[PDB]
Design a protein around this ligand. Structure first.
Ligand SMILES: C[C@H](CCC(=O)NCCC[N+](C)(C)C[C@H](O)CS(=O)(=O)O)[C@H]1CC[C@H]2[C@@H]3[C@H](O)C[C@@H]4C[C@H](O)CC[C@]4(C)[C@H]3C[C@H](O)[C@]12C
Ligand SMILES: C[C@H](CCC(=O)NCCC[N+](C)(C)C[C@H](O)CS(=O)(=O)O)[C@H]1CC[C@H]2[C@@H]3[C@H](O)C[C@@H]4C[C@H](O)CC[C@]4(C)[C@H]3C[C@H](O)[C@]12C
Ligand SMILES: C[C@H](CCC(=O)NCCC[N+](C)(C)C[C@H](O)CS(=O)(=O)O)[C@H]1CC[C@H]2[C@@H]3[C@H](O)C[C@@H]4C[C@H](O)CC[C@]4(C)[C@H]3C[C@H](O)[C@]12C
Ligand SMILES: C[C@H](CCC(=O)NCCC[N+](C)(C)C[C@H](O)CS(=O)(=O)O)[C@H]1CC[C@H]2[C@@H]3[C@H](O)C[C@@H]4C[C@H](O)CC[C@]4(C)[C@H]3C[C@H](O)[C@]12C
Ligand SMILES: [Mg+2]
Ligand SMILES: [Zn+2]
Lengths: 72, 154, 49, 51, 1341, 148, 50
């Protein structure tokens, strides 16, 4: 084939694997938790409605994402 | 080192010299003789190296006197050479190019990989030679024994 | 014909501003430019390959 | 010449000549030996003008 | 409101958005840089003056033998541009400097100067720039590309992932000065902060702070906030700001107000702090359990014993609480640490920090800089004062200081030159604030770190290097510095500095041959941003990090122009509207938006400044006031883009083009193409060889006219007026009286540049586009060049394409051109060559250029004249004799029976050897021009005398036609004087014009005026007499040839390559193709009217490659020729101008809003007829790049014709004469012709020359040798069973120097064997492996 | 002839590098012999033997010694352990990838009128690849008595 | 001057016709001709080796 078509297939692979990585991160399935899995605080049922199966609060979730920003 | 050894071997205090500045001359002379004799790849003689450095000194002097640069016809009158020795001198006094020079204008090549062979006989020529041998042999067979023998021998 | 997805910037992280247009329609400046990231990553890999 | 084959500047390196290695047994034991000996005893001179 | 020179034909132009900032002079980078380099500049800034000032004044070895500077001048060249391309000199300019050697006296601190010897001394020749930013180094017009390197300053790189393998990242920070020692910072995995001077060993990063006269207390109070602890009558009370304790576990209940505001154990939520702020707490008492791990900052020692209680930066415990308790310590200052935000970094690095005070740190730094050097007080103090803090060894150039201050978000643009306390302190605070969470790294691509050198700056740097290596010799010669004997030139040697500058301009990875094959290609080569070369990063070290596009390339580098292949992204193309900043960065335009108005004031923004605004986007509707028609409009803020309010945007983009370059903006319908296919499109449009009768773009993008004019090919009128004399060679404008200078008015003259070789061996031609007696506005194109039509760039020609497979003569990506395309000569392009035939000076004798040659009868020498150079006009073919030449060759040394032949026939084999220049096999052209050169020691032959005669008559005629005009202007001035004081109008012209000088006149100032003007006239006479003399002396005098040559003879062939299977044609959208069958007219398809579609591409190439652009272009071109044919009928049934007016005026208004309205009720009848005649070929439609023709507009412009709105036609096959089912596409696609022609790639070698060290095939002409039968091919031939084929593939055919001739004799004998033997390469391998101490042998059994 | 000194056009010669290295080694050997005849002090002969050691060690490999001895260029001059090694040594570069007489090339094209066992081919590449075959056949059919 | 290759074999060479350049060699001997016919002819390698 051509030097463009190979690049098309590689770009499709790259965007596919990215999109699947970020669909895998979202939960949308699990059992209701009723309270944080880190601090014990309650998860308000609105946030649980937005994501079925939120193992964390918003506070602990933000904290964990924020430590993970430095990738450790 | 060699020059300093010769200086030691040919020193005397009976002329009141200072040995440091005495041996400085011998050192510089021996190193000059060496840098002339065994520096160029193809070895040029001593007087030739003196002529070459004369040409370089005068080339620098003219290349800021005349402004642009001097021609051989002008060097043959600042220098007083026969106008043809200058051509031969400035032909000779240049180094050789390193045959592993990278002619990087390719995949990856070298100047050495581009110098063809000149003395090889073409396969066309070799075939023609063999054919001509055969032809002249049959021709000479197309003579008598005495004829062919004399015409081979002469 | 349909829209064309979400250009993935060469870091690996997928940009969140999708291309709500397609090739039968135009592509305004931002959208074509965002396409440029993934296009040039494809080139810079099928040049090393 | 030891096991390490870099010496680096940049850390990596991908599919471009990817996952390269040569075992080169019986060179590592002598190279590491030369290191541990050059460090422990004294610092050796190099070249001959400096000699 | 169009000019009379644009009404020739007026492009129908779609494209809504009213532009505001017309395209810049496309070459401003080149011209502006080299103008700033070489210009007398009374200020130390950019220019040679910067170079001289820095090196100078200079001084001898402390004894006052000084050598200062005065000024410099650029003397005129000896050879102008065209003679310097004809001959082969470097179009240089002599350099001249007014140095001054001044010497103070021995025992003279500052006493009066004793000697000052002044003189002007030569050095180098800085090659001057042509009009078009193209230097002329050795006959070949060369172009220096702008480099792209790191702006010296601060960076915060990341190095994320790989190191340490635990997923943890680091944050190194580098402070790179323009000159001086680096300074790196970095974290370990263990999180201690580590400093390092130039790439030497690591150190505890606090060591530099202690060495900056900082002790531990102020270190901790630099890098931390404070949390106090108190004991107010009970158990360790606490101060508590609400922000401190966000999201953490408590080792206590949150008690206050006699109340539980918070219960222990929970992580302190936000609403926690909200309620506490509704509380206003200043205090909560907690147990010792939470102070048992704090970090006490300030030093505590007893008030009664003065004893060391708790040291700085130790973690207290309860016993330590009591220890500092009972002797009166009420305040305990503790670091406010945390794992998320305010992490322990400086404290823990203090843990690692062995040294304590300034002395120990200085000692450690001193030993780290130079090993084994004993530590000493003043030693270390001076070392740390000269690492980063003294003018000598460390200088952030002002570029650097700007980056440094700006990158720390510091207000001032300019400041100090070197580091200082708060500089290093803010670098460390910024590194920490990066790693805490609040900040971002600056990846390498961001154009706030890519400062663009260009021709002026790099030439300045190389001349800088020249000056430093010369001032070595200057201070050397001033070692023995004599007072009144050595003038200020014996010291200085030109050939060093001149050699350096020549090395740059001719030996560099930047000074490279220009692409002269296409005006688009010239003007997209001069405009280029390269990352490679000296000072920049090469391929392997770098590296992907910079092969990529970063979100700040928008308007500063084309995203879709970069040569795919080995180095993508390293060869970015400078964008359309973009410039170079003052300091050197790239900067694009924007429109300043006021409160809600889009004010017109364009406003150049750099790359480091773009994020801190909120930029609108040019696809925004604005309603005749600069008001955005909505309340929200799409914008980009910091990379990210997102809908923003109406009153938030601070800038709107200038015009829709600025994202793209000039290469990719001449592609119609770029908005409908994948970025890769558009990249290949632009990258092939830069290559289209200029065809013979260049047509025009039937669909273009408006920019084509600017790229035609702003290149150098066309000839823009310097002043406007009437065209007095159009000729095939020149044009003679008579400049209007509006623009005609009062002194010696005269006229302009434009000697066109006819057929001359280009760097790519194509035909750079110029034809005249204006017919006699015509007006010409200022700034008009008078002479088309290569690929320019009436001032519009036509690279290829437009031809009637149709998408349908058709028997698979276009299978993969092929094209199927019908012989109606090859008959007309509409790709018949022209190629011109420069065949040389030198005549060297061998030791055996000199080669002559004699015509009398041995063993070539008068059958081939019929063409040569009496001197061995072919006639100007021969129709030589492959093999003739162009320059009959013979070299001496002694030593006949014949053989056996050959000698018998000599005896039988008496044929005397002369000592003469034929080595004439015979035409390279395959070409059949017309020798258009022969030039001869001669070292000035050889008697010029007969033909060289013809050529001097001819050129001298030419120059005489030209210079006479010049001097006529000049002395006519002087006559005009004298006449304008006579009207003052003695005006006698119509009895002053009847007599001869020469009889005006000898006319009397009143003895006023006016008579002395006639005196002066008579002197001017006679001086003009004498002066151009001598100027003709100087032309004749440039011709007649010899040449300065290479050493050892007598006379070189160049013969220019002019082949005319037509078109044929192999010649890659390709549209503008990156649809390649190798034309593969040149079909009869009959066999092609043909729509129902008779017209046979020319090219027949492959439909299977569009859906697989998202470049539907070409299909929209085909429909639009079809409609455009529809308008063209309607005009053709209306003109050929010739109706009346009213019909054409109504119809063309319909074609230009056409529906949707535009920026085009023409109003043809202003043209005269004898213009609209001209306009119609220039439109009958097809109405040229435009489409600005991202403002294209929306499809409904094309459907309507097809209805304006009579084509089918669907865009498709029923095509009747041309062989079977029956309708192709399912209507196909047709239309006119604009197709280039890339110069990968077939008769340059074809090659075949049966037995050529051979190499010298390794006897392998090495032939030259078209690599006149075998194909590289490399390694993987050998694996192929091993994979088969093929063993004999392989053997004769690399033993007989290739190397074994007996096997090959035995093979050839056997082949001619019709006996296909091969007596192989053993290769020659392995034999060389034995001799080499054996030259070492290695006995290699061959066992024999 | 494996390290030639070819006469290039103009008097300029383009020699290989082994001539340079051997010239250095022969110089140093002769100089050491000359020192021995005089019997210089031991610092002299020691430095000379070291120089000869470095010269020979640069002749063989020009590496493993720490710093190559580059020629009049700034480019390190190749040596006998380096004309065998590398992707340009005789092994990989002239014992596997060798040019080949009787070859050619061109732009490929489409050509659907072929059975799959016959590639098209130009008249001119054919008449340049098969000159020996042509010559044999033409001296066979007596259309040219001699090969010329 | 174009080597008019067959169409089907292009999948095997992995060669579109965008200007790609194939090289022709020639088998000199007689064993090499029988091998360029009985082992490397086009119509004896239609099954992919893998
Ligand atoms: C681009 C590449 C073709 C290039 C030749 C094709 C071939 C196999 C494809 C992946 C696998 O199917 C596994 C998985 C399936 C999921 O459904 C979607 C994601 C995954 C990761 C796919 C991404 C991509 O599409 C791949 C790499
Ligand atoms: C055009 C080509 C570069 C292509 C990019 C340049 C690079 C080096 C050039 C050779 C050298 O001059 C040495 C030698 C001089 C002889 O006298 C004439 C033949 C040789 C082989 C030259 C032919 C040609 O000129 C060469 C290959
Ligand atoms: C009238 C004017 C001077 C003012 C009185 C003089 C000065 C120079 C003269 C022209 C030049 O020679 C160039 C040109 C050459 C052609 O071959 C013949 C025509 C041209 C137009 C000449 C006619 C005329 O004589 C000119 C304009
Ligand atoms: C440095 C450059 C590499 C490509 C850049 C190489 C490639 C071609 C080489 C020249 C040719 O041999 C021709 C000529 C032969 C003379 O006799 C000696 C000088 C010349 C000028 C050579 C010097 C140098 O070696 C050149 C420029
Ligand atoms: Mg291809
Ligand atoms: Zn929670």
């Amino acid at each position: 084939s051509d030097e463009a078509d190979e690049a098309y297939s590689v770009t499709e692979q790259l965007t596919m694997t990215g999109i699947n990585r970020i669909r895998q991160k979202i939960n949308a399935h699990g059992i209701p938790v009723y309270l944080c899995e880190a601090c014990g605080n309650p998860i308000p049922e609105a946030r649980r409605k937005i994501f079925p199966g939120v193992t964390l609060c918003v506070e602990c979730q933000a904290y964990q994402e924020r430590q993970r920003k430095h990738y450790a | 080192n060699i020059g300093l050894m010769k200086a030691v071997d040919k020193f005397e205090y009976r002329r009141g010299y200072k040995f440091s500045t005495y041996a400085t001359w011998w050192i510089r002379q021996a190193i000059t003789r060496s840098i002339a004799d065994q520096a160029r790849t193809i070895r040029i003689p001593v007087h030739m190296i003196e002529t070459i450095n004369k040409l370089n000194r005068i080339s620098r002097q003219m290349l800021q006197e005349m402004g642009r640069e001097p021609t051989p016809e002008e060097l043959a009158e600042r220098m007083l050479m026969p106008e043809d020795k200058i051509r031969k001198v400035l032909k000779i006094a240049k180094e050789p190019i390193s045959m592993e020079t990278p002619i990087g204008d390719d995949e990856d090549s070298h100047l050495g990989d581009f110098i063809e062979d000149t003395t090889l006989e073409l396969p066309l020529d070799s075939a023609t030679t063999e054919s001509l041998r055969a032809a002249t042999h049959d021709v000479l067979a197309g003579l008598t024994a005495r004829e062919a023998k004399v015409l081979r021998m002469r | 014909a349909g829209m064309r997805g979400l250009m993935a910037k060469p870091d690996g992280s997928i940009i969140e501003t999708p291309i709500t247009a397609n090739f039968r329609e135009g592509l305004n400046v931002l959208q074509y430019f965002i396409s440029t990231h993934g296009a040039r990553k494809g080139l810079a890999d099928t040049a090393l390959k | 010449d030891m096991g390490i084959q870099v010496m680096e500047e940049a850390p990596d390196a991908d599919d471009l000549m990817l996952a390269e290695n040569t075992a080169d047994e019986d060179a590592a034991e002598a190279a590491a030996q030369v290191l541990s000996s050059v460090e422990s005893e004294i610092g050796r001179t190099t070249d001959p003008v400096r000699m | 409101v169009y000019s009379y020179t644009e009404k020739k034909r007026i492009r129908k132009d779609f494209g809504k958005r009213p532009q505001v900032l017309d395209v810049p002079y496309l070459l401003s980078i080149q011209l502006d840089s080299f103008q700033k380099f070489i210009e007398q500049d009374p200020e130390g800034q950019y220019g040679l003056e910067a170079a001289f000032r820095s090196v100078f004044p200079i001084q001898s070895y402390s004894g006052n033998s000084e050598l200062q500077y005065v000024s410099y001048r650029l003397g005129e060249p000896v050879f102008d541009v065209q003679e310097c391309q004809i001959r082969g000199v470097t179009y240089s300019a002599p350099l001249r400097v007014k140095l001054r050697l001044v010497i103070y006296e021995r025992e003279a601190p500052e006493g009066t100067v004793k000697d000052i010897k002044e003189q002007e001394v030569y050095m180098g020749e800085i090659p001057l720039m042509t009009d078009n930013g193209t230097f002329v180094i050795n006959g070949t017009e060369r172009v220096i590309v702008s480099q792209l390197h790191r702006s010296p300053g601060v960076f915060f790189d990341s190095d994320k992932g790989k190191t340490h393998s635990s997923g943890k990242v680091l944050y190194n920070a580098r402070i790179i000065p323009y000159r001086g020692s680096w300074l790196d910072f970095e974290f370990d995995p263990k999180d201690n902060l580590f400093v390092r001077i130039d790439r030497r060993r690591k150190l505890p990063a606090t060591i530099i702070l202690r060495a900056l006269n900082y002790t531990t207390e102020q270190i901790l109070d630099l890098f931390f906030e404070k949390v106090i602890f108190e004991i107010r009558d009970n158990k360790l009370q606490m101060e508590l700001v609400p922000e401190r304790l966000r999201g953490e576990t408590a080792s206590f209940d949150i008690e206050a107000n006699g109340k539980v505001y918070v219960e222990k154990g929970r992580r302190i939520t936000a609403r926690h702090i909200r309620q506490l702020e509704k509380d206003d707490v200043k205090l909560i008492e907690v147990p010792v359990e939470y102070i048992a791990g704090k970090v006490v900052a300030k030093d505590y020692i007893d008030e009664s014993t003065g004893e060391l209680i708790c040291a700085a930066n130790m973690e207290l415990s309860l016993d330590l609480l009591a220890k500092l308790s009972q002797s009166g310590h009420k305040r305990i200052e503790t670091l406010f640490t945390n794992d998320l935000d305010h992490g322990p970094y400086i404290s823990e690095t203090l843990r690692v920090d062995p040294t304590n005070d300034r002395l120990s740190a200085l000692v450690e730094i001193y030993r780290m800089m130079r090993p084994g050097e004993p530590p000493t007080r003043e030693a270390a103090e001076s070392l740390f004062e000269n690492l980063f803090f003294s003018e000598d060894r460390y200088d952030l150039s002002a570029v650097g200081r700007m980056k440094f201050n700006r990158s720390l978000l510091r207000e001032e643009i300019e400041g100090s030159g070197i580091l200082s306390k708060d500089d290093i302190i803010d670098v460390m605070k910024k590194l920490i604030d990066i790693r805490n969470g609040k900040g971002e790294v600056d990846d390498i691509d961001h154009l706030g770190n890519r400062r663009i050198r260009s021709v002026g700056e790099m030439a300045e740097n190389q001349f800088r290097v020249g000056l430093v290596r010369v001032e070595r010799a200057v201070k050397e010669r001033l070692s023995l510095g004599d007072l009144d004997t050595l003038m200020p030139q014996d010291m200085i040697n030109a050939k060093p500095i001149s050699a350096a500058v020549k090395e740059f301009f001719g030996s560099s990875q930047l000074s490279q041959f220009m692409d002269q094959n296409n005006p688009l290609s010239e003007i997209t080569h001069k405009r280029r941003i390269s990352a490679l070369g000296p000072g920049g990063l090469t391929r392997e070290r770098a590296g992907f990090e910079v092969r990529d596009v970063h979100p700040t390339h928008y308007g500063r580098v084309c995203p879709i122009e970069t040569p795919e292949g080995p180095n993508i992204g390293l060869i970015n193309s400078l964008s359309v509207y973009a410039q170079t900043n003052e300091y050197g960065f790239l900067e694009t335009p924007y429109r300043k938006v006021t409160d809600g108005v889009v004010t017109d004031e364009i406003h150049y923004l750099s790359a480091i400044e773009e994020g801190n605004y909120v930029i609108a986007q040019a696809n925004s509707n604005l309603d005749e006031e600069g008001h955005f028609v909505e309340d929200l409009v799409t914008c980009r803020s910091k990379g990210e883009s997102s809908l923003f309010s109406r009153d938030q945007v601070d800038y709107m983009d200038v015009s829709t083009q600025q994202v793209v370059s000039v290469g990719a903006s001449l592609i119609p319908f770029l908005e409908h193409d994948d970025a890769n296919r558009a990249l290949m499109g632009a990258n092939m449009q830069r290559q289209a060889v200029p065809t013979l009768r260049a047509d025009k773009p039937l669909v273009g993008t408006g920019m084509e006219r600017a790229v035609a004019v702003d290149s150098g090919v066309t000839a823009v009128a310097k002043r406007g007026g009437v065209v007095q004399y159009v000729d095939a060679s020149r044009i003679v404008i008579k400049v209007n009286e509006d623009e005609m200078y009062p002194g010696e008015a005269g006229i302009d003259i434009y000697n066109l540049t006819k057929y001359t070789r280009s760097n790519q061996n194509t035909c750079i031609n110029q034809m005249p586009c204006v017919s006699l007696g015509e007006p010409v506005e200022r700034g008009d194109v008078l002479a088309d060049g290569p690929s320019t039509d009436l001032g519009e760039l036509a690279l290829g020609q437009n031809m009637r394409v149709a998408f349908m497979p058709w028997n698979g003569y276009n299978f993969e990506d092929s094209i199927l051109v019908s012989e109606r395309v090859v008959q007309e000569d509409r790709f018949t392009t022209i190629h011109i060559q420069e065949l040389a035939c030198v005549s060297r000076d061998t030791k055996l004798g000199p080669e002559e250029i004699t015509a009398d040659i041995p063993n070539v009868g008068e059958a081939a020498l019929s063409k040569l004249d009496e001197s061995g150079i072919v006639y100007i006009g021969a129709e030589v073919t492959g093999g003739d004799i162009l320059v009959g030449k013979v070299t001496p060759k002694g030593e006949t040394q014949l053989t056996p029976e050959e000698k018998l032949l000599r005896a039988i026939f008496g044929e005397k084999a002369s000592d003469v050897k034929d080595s004439s220049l015979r035409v390279p096999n395959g070409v059949s052209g017309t020798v258009i021009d022969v030039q001869v050169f001669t070292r000035d020691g050889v008697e010029k032959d007969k033909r060289a005398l013809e050529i001097e005669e001819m050129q001298l008559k030419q120059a005489k005629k030209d210079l006479s036609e010049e001097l006529q005009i000049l002395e006519a202007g002087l006559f005009s001035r004298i006449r304008a004087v006579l009207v003052a004081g003695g005006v006698e109008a119509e009895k002053l012209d009847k007599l001869p014009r020469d009889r005006w000088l000898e006319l009397g006149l009143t003895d006023e100032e006016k008579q002395n005026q006639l005196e002066q003007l008579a002197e001017q006239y006679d001086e003009l006479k004498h002066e151009f007499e001598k100027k003709l003399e100087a032309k004749r002396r440039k011709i007649t005098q010899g040449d300065d040839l290479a050493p050892g040559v007598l006379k070189i003879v160049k013969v220019y062939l002019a082949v005319k390559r037509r078109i044929q299977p192999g010649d890659k044609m390709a549209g503008r959208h990156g649809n390649k193709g190798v034309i593969s069958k040149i079909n009869p007219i009959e066999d092609m398809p043909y729509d129902e009217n008779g017209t046979p579609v020319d090219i027949v591409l492959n439909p299977l190439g569009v859906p697989s490659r998202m470049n539907i652009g070409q299909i929209l272009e085909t429909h639009l071109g079809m409609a455009a020729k529809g308008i063209g044919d309607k005009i053709n009928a209306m003109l050929k049934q010739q109706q009346e101008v009213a019909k054409l007016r109504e119809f063309i005026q319909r074609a230009y208004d056409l529906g949707a809003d535009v920026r085009q309205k023409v109003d043809l009720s202003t043209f005269s009848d004898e213009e609209v007829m001209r306009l119609a005649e220039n439109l009958r070929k097809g109405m040229p439609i435009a489409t600005p790049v991202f403002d294209g023709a929306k499809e409904a507009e094309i459907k309507e412009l097809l209805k304006l014709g009579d084509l089918p709105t669907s865009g498709q036609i029923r095509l009747y096959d041309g062989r079977t004469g029956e309708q192709f089912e399912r209507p196909v596409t047709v239309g006119y696609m604009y197709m280039l012709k890339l110069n990968h022609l077939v008769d340059d790639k074809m090659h075949a070698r049966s037995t050529g020359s051979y190499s010298l060290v390794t006897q392998q095939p090495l032939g030259g002409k078209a690599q006149f040798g075998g194909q590289r039968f490399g390694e993987m091919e050998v694996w192929a031939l091993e994979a088969y069973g093929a063993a004999y084929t392989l053997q004769e593939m690399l033993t007989v055919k290739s190397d074994d120097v007996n096997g090959r001739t035995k093979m050839y004799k056997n082949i001619v004998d019709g006996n296909h064997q091969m007596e192989p033997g053993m290769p020659e390469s392995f034999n060389v391998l034995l001799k080499e492996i054996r030259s070492l101490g290695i006995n290699i042998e061959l066992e024999d059994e | 002839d494996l390290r030639p000194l070819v006469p290039l056009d103009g008097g300029r010669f383009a020699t290989s590098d082994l001539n340079d290295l051997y010239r250095r080694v022969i110089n140093r050997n002769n100089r050491l012999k000359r020192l021995l005849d005089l019997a210089a002090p031991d610092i002299i002969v020691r430095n000379e033997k070291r120089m000869l050691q470095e010269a020979v060690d640069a002749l063989l490999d020009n590496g493993r010694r720490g710093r190559a001895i580059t020629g009049s260029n700034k480019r390190p001059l190749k040596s006998l352990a380096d004309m065998i090694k590398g992707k340009q040594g005789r092994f990989r570069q002239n014992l596997l990838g060798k040019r080949v007489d009787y070859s050619g090339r061109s732009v490929i094209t489409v050509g659907p009128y072929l059975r799959l066992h016959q590639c098209g081919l130009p008249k001119k590449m054919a008449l340049e690849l098969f000159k020996p075959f042509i010559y044999g056949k033409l001296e066979l059919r007596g259309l040219a008595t001699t090969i010329k | 001057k174009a080597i008019q290759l067959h169409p089907l074999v292009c999948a095997a060479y992995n060669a579109d016709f965008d200007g790609d350049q194939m090289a022709v060699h020639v088998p000199l001997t007689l064993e090499a001709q029988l091998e360029a016919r009985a082992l490397m002819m086009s119509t004896n390698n239609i099954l992919s080796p893998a």
